[PDB]
Design a protein around this nucleic acid. Structure first.
Ligand SMILES: [Mg+2]
Ligand SMILES: [Mg+2]
Ligand SMILES: [Mg+2]
Ligand SMILES: [Mg+2]
Ligand SMILES: [Mg+2]
Ligand SMILES: [Mg+2]
Ligand SMILES: [Mg+2]
Ligand SMILES: [Mg+2]
Ligand SMILES: [Mg+2]
Ligand SMILES: [Mg+2]
Ligand SMILES: [Mg+2]
Ligand SMILES: [Mg+2]
Ligand SMILES: [Mg+2]
Ligand SMILES: [Mg+2]
Ligand SMILES: [Mg+2]
Ligand SMILES: [Mg+2]
Ligand SMILES: [Mg+2]
Ligand SMILES: [Mg+2]
Ligand SMILES: [Mg+2]
Ligand SMILES: [Mg+2]
Ligand SMILES: [Mg+2]
Ligand SMILES: [Mg+2]
Ligand SMILES: [Mg+2]
Ligand SMILES: [Mg+2]
Ligand SMILES: [Mg+2]
Ligand SMILES: [Mg+2]
Ligand SMILES: [Mg+2]
Ligand SMILES: [Mg+2]
Ligand SMILES: [Mg+2]
Ligand SMILES: [Mg+2]
Ligand SMILES: [Mg+2]
Ligand SMILES: [Mg+2]
Ligand SMILES: [Mg+2]
Ligand SMILES: [Mg+2]
Ligand SMILES: [Mg+2]
Ligand SMILES: [Mg+2]
Ligand SMILES: [Mg+2]
Ligand SMILES: [Mg+2]
Ligand SMILES: [Mg+2]
Ligand SMILES: [Mg+2]
Ligand SMILES: [Mg+2]
Ligand SMILES: [Mg+2]
Ligand SMILES: [Mg+2]
Ligand SMILES: [Mg+2]
Ligand SMILES: [Mg+2]
Ligand SMILES: [Mg+2]
Ligand SMILES: [Mg+2]
Ligand SMILES: [Mg+2]
Ligand SMILES: [Mg+2]
Ligand SMILES: [Mg+2]
Ligand SMILES: [Mg+2]
Ligand SMILES: [Mg+2]
Ligand SMILES: [Mg+2]
Ligand SMILES: [Mg+2]
Ligand SMILES: [Mg+2]
Ligand SMILES: [Mg+2]
Ligand SMILES: [Mg+2]
Ligand SMILES: [Mg+2]
Ligand SMILES: [Mg+2]
Ligand SMILES: [Mg+2]
Ligand SMILES: [Mg+2]
Ligand SMILES: [Mg+2]
Ligand SMILES: [Mg+2]
Ligand SMILES: [Mg+2]
Ligand SMILES: [Mg+2]
Lengths: 147, 210
RNA sequence: CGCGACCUCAGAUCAGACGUGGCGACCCGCUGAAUUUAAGCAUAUUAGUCAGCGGAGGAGAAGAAACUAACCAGGAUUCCCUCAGUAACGGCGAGUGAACAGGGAAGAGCCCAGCGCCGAAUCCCCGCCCCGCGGCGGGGCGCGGGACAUGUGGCGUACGGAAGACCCGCUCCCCGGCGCCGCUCGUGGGGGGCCCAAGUCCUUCUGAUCGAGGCCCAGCCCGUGGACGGUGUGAGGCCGGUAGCGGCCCCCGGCGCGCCGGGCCCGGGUCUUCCCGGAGUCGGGUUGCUUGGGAAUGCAGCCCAAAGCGGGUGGUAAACUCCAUCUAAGGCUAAAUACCGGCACGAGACCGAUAGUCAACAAGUACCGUAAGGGAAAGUUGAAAAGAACUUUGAAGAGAGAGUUCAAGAGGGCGUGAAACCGUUAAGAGGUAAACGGGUGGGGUCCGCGCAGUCCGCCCGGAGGAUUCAACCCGGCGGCGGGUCCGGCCGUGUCGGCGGCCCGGCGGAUCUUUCCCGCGCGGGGGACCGUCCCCCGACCGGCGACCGGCCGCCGCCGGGCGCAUUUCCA
RNA sequence: UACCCACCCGACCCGUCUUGAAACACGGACCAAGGAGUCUAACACGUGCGCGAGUCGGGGGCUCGCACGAAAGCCGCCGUGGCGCAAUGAAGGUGAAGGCCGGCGCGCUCGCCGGCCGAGGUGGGAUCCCGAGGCCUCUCCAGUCCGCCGAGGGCGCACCACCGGCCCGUCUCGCCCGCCGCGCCGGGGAGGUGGAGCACGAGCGCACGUGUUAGGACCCGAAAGAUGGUGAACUAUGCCUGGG
RNA sequence: GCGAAAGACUAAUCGAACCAUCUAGUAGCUGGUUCCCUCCGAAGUUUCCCUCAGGAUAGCUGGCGCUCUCGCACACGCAGU
RNA sequence: CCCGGCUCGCUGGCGUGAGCCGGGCGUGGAAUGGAGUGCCUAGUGGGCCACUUUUGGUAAGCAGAACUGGCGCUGCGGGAUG
RNA sequence: CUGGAGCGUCGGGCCCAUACCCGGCCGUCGCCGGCAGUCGAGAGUGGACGGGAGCGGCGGGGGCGGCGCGCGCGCGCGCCCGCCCCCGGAGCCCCGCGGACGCUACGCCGCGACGAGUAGGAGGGCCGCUGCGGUGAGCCUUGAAGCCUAGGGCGCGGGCCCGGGUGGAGCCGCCGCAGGUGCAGAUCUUGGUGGUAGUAGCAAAUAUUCAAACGAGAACUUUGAAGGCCGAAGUGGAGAAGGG
RNA sequence: ACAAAGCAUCGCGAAGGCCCGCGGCGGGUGUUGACGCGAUGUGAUUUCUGCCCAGUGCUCUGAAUGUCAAAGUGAAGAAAU
RNA sequence: CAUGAAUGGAUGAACGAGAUUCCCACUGUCCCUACCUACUAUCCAGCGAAACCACAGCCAAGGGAACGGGCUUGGCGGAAUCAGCGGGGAAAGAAGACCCUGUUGAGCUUGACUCUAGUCUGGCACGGUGAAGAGACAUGUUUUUUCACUGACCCGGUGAGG
RNA sequence: CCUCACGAUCCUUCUGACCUUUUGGGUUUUAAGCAGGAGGUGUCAGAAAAGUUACCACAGGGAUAACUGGCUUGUGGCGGC
RNA sequence: GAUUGUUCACCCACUAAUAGGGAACGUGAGCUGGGUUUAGACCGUCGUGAGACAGGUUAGUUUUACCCUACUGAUGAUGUG
């Protein structure tokens, strides 16, 4: 609101928080992101390094749907499925191992972060990591692919 | 004139946003303009599914989106000769006909056929005249209803089937699922080059012979 | 050296139609900068924007893929969200800068040409009648015209269609009238007219009340009505109104039965024969504009210019080569969708007459410029003109009385009526221009007082004078506090009931299709865990959550106590 | 305290640009009225509130003639998505996990197999816990309670410094391979370095402050440029027709 | 445009009219910038600049803060010394 | 500081050297004062004067540095005035 | 001004700043501040409770002393034994049984310390303007806003509050929210008003005078008379365009 | 000063010179024809008009072995080439 | 320094509100001034404006934005005014026309950079008929020189008259 | 022997890897990357750029000149030992 | 006095001398405007040209006092009944 502004406290205050030596003139520097090479250089070079120039390779027309691929970490599969499906098993005595469609919860790829609880699993996913492989194997249980 | 850490910002107001600004103080009166259509259309077509005709189960395209399903435009043609519904009749019976779908699989064909088979069965064909003959459903199955279907006819919900826990045979537990991806992605990589060498090596067996 | 068909082409104030201007927000073609931006600067951008120009309607354009895609695929348009301020473009810099998927509003699809089938099955204009005539139309009857064989009607159009054979089942739509029956959502469709509660009750203010108390429940009445405006001040009640499936009368709208006149022999499913795409178009070369399209996204001119298992597309040129997906060169269309112009309304954290639109009024007015054009100022008496009758001074303008007014110190540019500014009355000052800061002093106008301001408040002692008590019990009433947690009710933590669990539900991709219903799936039921309720029993916080008794204390009321008491007064 | 007056001391006219103004710099006769940091988008930090590995907001829907209403309420919407929940590479893509123990492979600081523990350590680290010893307490002793003091010792967040570790890129080096297939296939090591990385999380939504831009842009303030139009009534010329 | 030629004149206008719009044109440049009080309180210094009337970043300032110490008989640190 | 012990692929006849674990040992010149560290960020970026040092210039109220001190930015007693 | 009021070197004595001291008062910062109902002033504990006993004690330093002593333990009373008793009452400087008047818990209170300022920041504004949601049994025809006041006051001050008159219709206080929000300045905009000032000025063509009329009023009109001018290339008599 | 008369060059035989226009088979000179039209120079009369084609222009039935696009034709290739 | 031949050189009769120089006559041009008239100013009746103004307005010197009215010290000052006057108020008029800078312009110029209308030439297009004949390559193709033709195309004239 | 003796972005080229992309697949060209070298900005942190204006204009400027004034006094003038 | 826009000079002449200076380089609302120094023009040179030239030459609008002051005069003024 208007009421809670400095401009209220700057009346009778001649130059208006803006200096009477060098006034508030219109557009001293330039207009917007202007003088990046020349003379505003010191910002752009010290504060946004790697702005000026090309790099890399075009992929031109590009569509993200083509390369949609979310990630999950082992870390939290023992979320995706209702926690009761874990408490059931860890127990049960038959080596059930519940199935986890990392598909069905919304992730085109599973990755090996974190601990995994000592508990056999069947993870059905798309693009598994290596480490995700190893951890699941080394716990017990398996890595099934989906198309 | 930037000062000490921000972003760059290419705000695009160098043109003339000012003239062509649409504010939205229609929004709520529009909400209501709309209400009165939804409303009126229903009272006009009294017994008829308010939402609109029956529309097919259909799979979303691009790779990310795969696992979803939709109300499609309309049921295919191939689909109908199968359900035994004439395409020009369907259009009068509140059955939505796209006639522009390449049907590729028996899975999504019969899935989508079952919707028509379902529809027939729970459809009260309200007869041409009052004193009318065949195919119109009887004065009992007629009195019972005046019922507009509020909401989308036979709504398409993305439903999955649970897989019970298993035993994990020592065979699922051997498959190195990472390795086999890398294999896959290299055989698909080089399938073509590899084929040029069979084509050259088959050339050398004839070129050594001559 | 004629007459006659046709073809081309004239003339008609011929018979009948129609076109042209305007409006122009929104709508469509094109055209088209420069300020500006880049700290210059021309590249770029402003920006396909303004002007210019052309064109439409109640909306405009587009639209039934030569699309999307790379999926396990979708499926006309437009719009909103979203992608996403992203893929790329750029003295890769200022900037620029879209799209594909999903969700949602809405959602409707269709028609030509050709190939062919069908005695042009067609079409136009006359004349006579029958109905119909305030959007000119049906019905019939006419060797009454004419187009059309260089091609008019039906089916048909690619999602297949035609034609055949036998497979099945069986017959209602359309239009001109001409009636009639149900007035057919704001909660009786549109419009108009006409209509529907309750105080000027008392008293009292006031010029006038609409104001303030009161008036059988905040008073009286009404209140599906207490919005608002009017009404010589603030009024639910006086009046218009307001509310109110309140009433009635016209008209208009739309939809339902009958009669009639006309039109129409219009299905569904199977096996075969054949039949198919729109040319100076696509494409290419080039140049020019454009976007973002790119070793070319779009559009252009010119040049070259195709094919038929072809063509386009399938987004860095190209050859080969594999796969997908449409089908151009013909065309229509509601709906959402846009609306600073129009008519007609409704509202506001708005402005409130140097603001608000130039314009509250003779406002696009007065006036200016030859003209394009430019373009103002200016609201208010009072409630009622009741707007000074009459005497008098004054040539007359003006006055003095008087009169009207609640008020003329509201007098026709009148509410109020500031300051600069000027008008005069009173006081005081005044040779260093005034004006200013600090400090006093004199004087005034006012302001407090005092005809002692002796300021009050306790307590006490003394002396006068006067009511009922206080202290005490007893009857009652009401509090408070205490606990015995005594008894009961309440809830916290624990335990027991496995008792609600099915008479307790809901959540869970938990489990059984041993179940049931409907089509492996959906719905339903049944098992499981997590949750939330009953029974009672035990412990404990025993908690402001009480409620009952017992207590202890206080207060009030009513009794008792008549006076060394307990008050009042001086 | 205010009005006039009187005196004594003080004393230049404000505003502004300005190294320096009473300026022999400029604005400023006086008075009324009007009058200049505004809105939006985008960032950023700071802060307020909701919920929290989520959280939202629309746009849509369902609920109104609105009086209040163009409100409020509600929606597997509630997530179709944004933001966050992971980075790194130009790109194909890979992707945050280590310790330990035993066993097996010659522990060859190489490979694999069973168990245990799970985000490594050091130094600082608010600091919580333990605490030897006092320090009284009417007597001598005895002794439970109760606090104060308390040397010394333990856990140690947050944070900081360091040492370790793991993902990706790139290099170097060098080992063994699996074998739906054949390796100009895929795969595994050691060391170093680049990374806006992980190493037991902090975002989301909504406020408000500040700031910075884009925006007319704090107001006022050019010489220009462009697009369209009107003018020879003055004058300059030509012509036509008149007069001296 | 028109000029026997002088940048003459084009309706008080000419080194090239007037009118309206683009139009808040742009301006590193003049001027101004509107209520009280309290606290702290500069710089005209650094490197790059088509930079010298301006910017860029060095400074100095404020605010916002936080981590702690202990003046609670029982302190380490810092410093125009 | 001082003891003990471990590790190394570097270095070397052995040791060094470095790194760690484990123990043993306190006010280490005066005077002063509570210390640490993280964001945002305005104005400013024409300055001028004095002692002393000093470069141009002859000299300046001239031009340009050092060092410090002022004024700007801030009155007051004094320096008649400034 | 002159053995000086000149100049050297020197005394005493005195004079004065916003400087220092003491005090007064108003700011701010800090005090790990106290103060949300409690003992206690280099504080150096307090309390059960037992067994045993009593004039014991704790028979330690010219320390000058700090930690132990001369207002009591035990005692007066009840009579060697009991006690050593209850604040709804010790009578209270300590009171722990319950707590300010004071405690708007962003209130109030004591210490110290400190408060030059342009640009800028920041904070604080029962400082000010207009709008709305609340709220004030607000105010008002028994007189509101504005306006006016050598009428009493208050704040440091923004302003605020009070005294009267006039005015004639509406207004304000708090808690919130909302602004187009506070002027002396911009050769700022509009309207008005001064000084100048009763100032500049009413100077091109030689020219008027008398009488009467009319008239309230005559230098200015008219008639007469007289003097004059233009002086037919005119100030003569008619037209165009323009004017209407 | 300009113009002026006088002197002087220069292009032009109309599918042209010079010239306009946005455009047409558009228009002015032009109801013209070299004694005219267009383009310049000097400035009456008298006397005279000196040398320089080294630069830049202009220009010339001039070689264009200097180069030089499009298209055009030659070649490799599989095609852009 | 530094003329000069149609950027014309040299002359010159007439003419020039064209530039100089000298002489006669004349003259209030001057020694050096004087007087007279008309209209004013002036004074009155009537009518009455503007420009400008921070506040204002006696001086010296000091200092001082280095020439102040203010202030310091001095000098001093009697109300209200009229005609004059031009010494001062750096008087007014008029954000300097001189000069610098701006990434502010305009007008002009050319050997600036980048482009343009226009014109010259080449190619391609409408864009044909016939005829000869030649070379180059090859063992038909290409290049085509030259000359006709008239149907497009072009210009000529009229009342389209042989 | 030490202290100078050279240079971003974008652009161009050459080299390097059985490198990545060239995208509905595949093979070859071709193109884009990646990583190193060269072309180069002499204004050296990197503008692709001639004049004149006495016909001139606007923002500004005592930060920039031409008078007046101050200081200074080289020179000038004047005067001493 | 002659010359000269001139300050500056030089000469004739007189006398007594023909000293030197200041006052915003005394003195444009005192004048004039001769020279500087606009716009018109001409020659010299330079420039390719627009144009340049302390290189010459001729034509080229010279405002406003009434306001306070100073001064010159003129009335006056409080004081002396
Ligand atoms: Mg300030
Ligand atoms: Mg300023
Ligand atoms: Mg729908
Ligand atoms: Mg029209
Ligand atoms: Mg600029
Ligand atoms: Mg620019
Ligand atoms: Mg420019
Ligand atoms: Mg451009
Ligand atoms: Mg564009
Ligand atoms: Mg664009
Ligand atoms: Mg337009
Ligand atoms: Mg689409
Ligand atoms: Mg009413
Ligand atoms: Mg009313
Ligand atoms: Mg009524
Ligand atoms: Mg095309
Ligand atoms: Mg473009
Ligand atoms: Mg089509
Ligand atoms: Mg259409
Ligand atoms: Mg349409
Ligand atoms: Mg008005
Ligand atoms: Mg108005
Ligand atoms: Mg009025
Ligand atoms: Mg008024
Ligand atoms: Mg009145
Ligand atoms: Mg009145
Ligand atoms: Mg009224
Ligand atoms: Mg009045
Ligand atoms: Mg008065
Ligand atoms: Mg008097
Ligand atoms: Mg300046
Ligand atoms: Mg001065
Ligand atoms: Mg100025
Ligand atoms: Mg995003
Ligand atoms: Mg321009
Ligand atoms: Mg000229
Ligand atoms: Mg500056
Ligand atoms: Mg200097
Ligand atoms: Mg202060
Ligand atoms: Mg407002
Ligand atoms: Mg104001
Ligand atoms: Mg005469
Ligand atoms: Mg006449
Ligand atoms: Mg010549
Ligand atoms: Mg010659
Ligand atoms: Mg030559
Ligand atoms: Mg002057
Ligand atoms: Mg510059
Ligand atoms: Mg220019
Ligand atoms: Mg050139
Ligand atoms: Mg050597
Ligand atoms: Mg491709
Ligand atoms: Mg392909
Ligand atoms: Mg000139
Ligand atoms: Mg200066
Ligand atoms: Mg200065
Ligand atoms: Mg000087
Ligand atoms: Mg003389
Ligand atoms: Mg002079
Ligand atoms: Mg003058
Ligand atoms: Mg003068
Ligand atoms: Mg002259
Ligand atoms: Mg001249
Ligand atoms: Mg000559
Ligand atoms: Mg020359």
């Amino acid at each position: 609101p208007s009421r809670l502004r400095k401009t209220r406290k700057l009346r009778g205050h001649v130059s208006h928080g803006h200096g009477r030596i060098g006034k508030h003139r219109k557009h001293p520097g330039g207009r917007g992101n202007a003088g990046g090479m020349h003379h505003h250089r010191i910002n752009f070079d010290k504060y946004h390094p790697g702005y000026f120039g090309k790099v890399g390779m075009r992929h031109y027309h590009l569509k993200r749907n083509q390369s949609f691929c979310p990630t999950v970490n082992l870390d939290k599969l023992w979320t995706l499925v209702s926690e009761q499906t874990r408490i059931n098993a860890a127990k049960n005595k038959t080596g059930a191992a519940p199935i986890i469609d990392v598909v069905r919860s919304g992730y085109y790829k599973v990755l090996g972060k974190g601990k995994l609880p000592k508990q056999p699993v069947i993870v059905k996913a798309k693009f598994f990591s290596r480490r995700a492989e190893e951890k699941i194997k080394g716990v017990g249980g398996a890595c099934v692919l989906v198309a | 004139a930037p000062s000490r850490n921000g972003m760059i910002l290419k705000p695009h107001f160098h043109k003339d946003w000012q003239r062509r600004v649409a504010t939205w103080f229609n929004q709520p009166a529009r909400k209501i303009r709309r209400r009165k259509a939804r409303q009126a259309k229903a009272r006009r077509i009294a017994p008829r599914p308010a939402s609109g005709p029956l529309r097919p189960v259909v799979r979303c395209p691009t790779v990310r989106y795969h696992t979803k399903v939709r109300a499609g435009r309309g049921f295919s043609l191939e689909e109908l000769r199968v359900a035994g519904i004439h395409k020009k009749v369907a259009r009068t019976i509140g059955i939505s006909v796209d006639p522009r779908r390449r049907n590729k699989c028996t899975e999504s064909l019969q899935a989508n056929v079952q919707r028509l088979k379902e529809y027939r069965s729970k459809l009260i064909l309200f007869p041409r005249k009052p004193s009318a003959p065949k195919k119109g459903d009887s004065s009992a199955e007629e009195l019972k209803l005046a019922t507009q279907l509020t909401g989308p006819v036979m709504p398409i919900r993305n439903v999955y089937k649970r897989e019970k826990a298993r035993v994990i045979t020592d065979e699922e537990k051997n498959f190195k699922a990472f390795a086999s991806l890398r294999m896959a992605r290299a055989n698909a990589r080089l399938f073509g080059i590899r084929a040029k060498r069979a084509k050259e090596a088959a050339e050398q067996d004839v070129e050594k012979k001559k």
